Write an enzyme that holds these catalytic residues in place. Structure first.
Site, mmCIF file in Angstrom:
data_model
loop_
_atom_site.group_PDB
_atom_site.id
_atom_site.type_symbol
_atom_site.label_atom_id
_atom_site.label_comp_id
_atom_site.label_asym_id
_atom_site.label_seq_id
_atom_site.Cartn_x
_atom_site.Cartn_y
_atom_site.Cartn_z
ATOM 1 C CB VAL A 27 9.346 -14.923 27.967
ATOM 2 C CG1 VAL A 27 10.390 -15.309 28.672
ATOM 3 C CG2 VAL A 27 8.799 -16.029 27.165
ATOM 4 C CE1 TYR A 32 13.910 0.007 32.327
ATOM 5 C CE2 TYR A 32 11.696 -0.029 31.064
ATOM 6 C CZ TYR A 32 12.409 -0.049 32.054
ATOM 7 O OH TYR A 32 11.822 0.626 33.534
ATOM 8 N N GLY A 33 13.127 -3.676 27.163
ATOM 9 C CA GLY A 33 12.490 -4.658 26.091
ATOM 10 C C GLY A 33 11.531 -5.564 26.698
ATOM 11 C CG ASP A 165 21.483 -11.466 25.633
ATOM 12 O OD1 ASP A 165 20.870 -10.976 24.620
ATOM 13 O OD2 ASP A 165 20.482 -12.261 26.466
HETATM 14 O O1 LIG Z 1 18.219 -11.321 24.365
HETATM 15 C C1 LIG Z 1 17.884 -11.622 22.741
HETATM 16 C C2 LIG Z 1 18.843 -10.961 21.890
HETATM 17 C C3 LIG Z 1 18.493 -10.883 20.488
HETATM 18 C C4 LIG Z 1 16.806 -11.379 20.229
HETATM 19 C C5 LIG Z 1 16.222 -11.642 21.092
HETATM 20 C C6 LIG Z 1 16.662 -11.734 22.773
HETATM 21 CL CL1 LIG Z 1 15.401 -12.297 23.834
#
Ligand SMILES: Oc1ccccc1Cl
EC number: 2.7.11.24
Length: 351
Positions: A27, A32-33, A165
């Site tokens: 997605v 970062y991630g 977030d």
């Molecule tokens: O923004 C987040 C926060 C916790 C787990 C997964 C996502 Cl994409």
């Protein structure tokens, strides 16, 4: 008790996840991630699974990893993002390197709601009510969100809203630069690092969001920080004598004093056609002096929300121990602290 994990590479990234998560589909990637959508067979939910990038690469990044996990584990409220799961494929601290977080998969955010749909005043009441209910909770734990803006708010088909977030790692200088949505909802006192600030920075953000729901347009779409300041001061007026006192950076004071004095505008002539009660609320949110801004608990009791307000169903948070914020540790200490938090995680009930 440890589940069975399986591996797969998706867009040059190895994902090693418990079997319960199926049909992983990329997605996005950058905040970062990497993030995949998946189906969680144990809960029956569509979930977003985020693999953190280089979580313990430095002291800063390791503390940031800790901070995010602690915060997500604490948030337990209908109108705030929580953690469904958190896991690592490592079997011991010594091989601990990767961290995966799991939350509910969201569809629409408020940005595409405001861009694609006509909202009534009843929809505006309900949307803003829910942001304030969530923010009452958040602030009761002495947490500041810092990054409330429409793309950070998930809205479903029933107009039910969740705050997503938190501003955790400060945004880089460059991504707050120019004509960018990133800065348009930020309170004046933190637009530059020029004052220390409170929870009520988030209330300024809410006023900006509420104005945009009511008109369908950005309230302060500045082309840079100074352009944006001027848009703001034109609406709310330049600071008086009471308030210039409280400002403490001499350099800020000195620029502020260069500006021509402007009176506060009449909000009923800016927000033409709007409910007079909405306008009244906006005047209490969009106040330069942050000590005088309405708080979320105060705003929930405003007459604009009379049809949703329920004082026995606007819960506050358990105490949140943030003493780690002032603590100085090595990478492996932050990392070991993160490991204990992964390992102690207990999922929410299916009830
Ligand atoms: O923004 C987040 C926060 C916790 C787990 C997964 C996502 Cl994409």
């Amino acid at each position: 008790e440890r589940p069975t994990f399986y591996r797969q590479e998706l867009n040059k990234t190895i994902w090693e996840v418990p079997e319960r998560y199926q049909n992983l589909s990329p997605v996005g990637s950058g905040a970062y991630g990497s993030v995949c959508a998946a189906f969680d067979t144990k809960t029956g939910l569509r979930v977003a699974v985020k693999k953190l990038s280089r979580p313990f690469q430095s002291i800063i990044h390791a503390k940031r990893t800790y901070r995010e996990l602690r915060l997500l584990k604490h948030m337990k409220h209908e109108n705030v993002i929580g953690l469904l799961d958190v896991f690592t494929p490592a079997r011991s601290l010594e091989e601990f390197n990767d961290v995966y977080l799991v939350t509910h998969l969201m569809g629409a955010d408020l940005n595409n709601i405001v861009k694609c749909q006509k909202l009534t005043d009843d929809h505006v009441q309900f949307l803003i009510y829910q942001i304030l209910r969530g923010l009452k909770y958040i602030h009761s734990a002495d947490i500041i969100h810092r990054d409330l803006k429409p793309s950070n708010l998930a809205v479903n088909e029933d107009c039910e809203l969740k705050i997503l977030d938190f501003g955790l790692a400060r945004h880089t200088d460059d991504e707050m630069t120019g004509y960018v949505a990133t800065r348009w909802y930020r309170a004046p006192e933190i637009m530059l690092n020029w004052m220390h600030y409170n929870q009520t920075v988030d209330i300024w953000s809410v006023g900006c969001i509420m104005a945009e729901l009511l008109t369908g347009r950005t309230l302060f779409p500045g082309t840079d920080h100074i352009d944006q300041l001027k848009l703001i001061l034109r609406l709310v007026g330049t600071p008086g004598a009471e308030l210039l006192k409280k400002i403490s950076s001499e350099s800020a004071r000195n620029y502020i004093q260069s500006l021509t004095q402007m009176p506060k505008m009449n909000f009923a002539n800016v927000f033409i056609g709007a409910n007079p009660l909405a306008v009244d609320l906006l005047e209490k949110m969009l106040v330069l002096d942050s000590d005088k801004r309405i708080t979320a608990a105060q705003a929930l009791a405003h007459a604009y929300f009379a049809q949703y307000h329920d004082p026995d169903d606007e819960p506050v948070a358990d105490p949140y121990d943030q003493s780690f914020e002032s603590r100085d540790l090595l990478i492996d200490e932050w990392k070991s602290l993160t490991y204990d938090e992964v390992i102690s995680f207990v999922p929410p009930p299916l009830d």
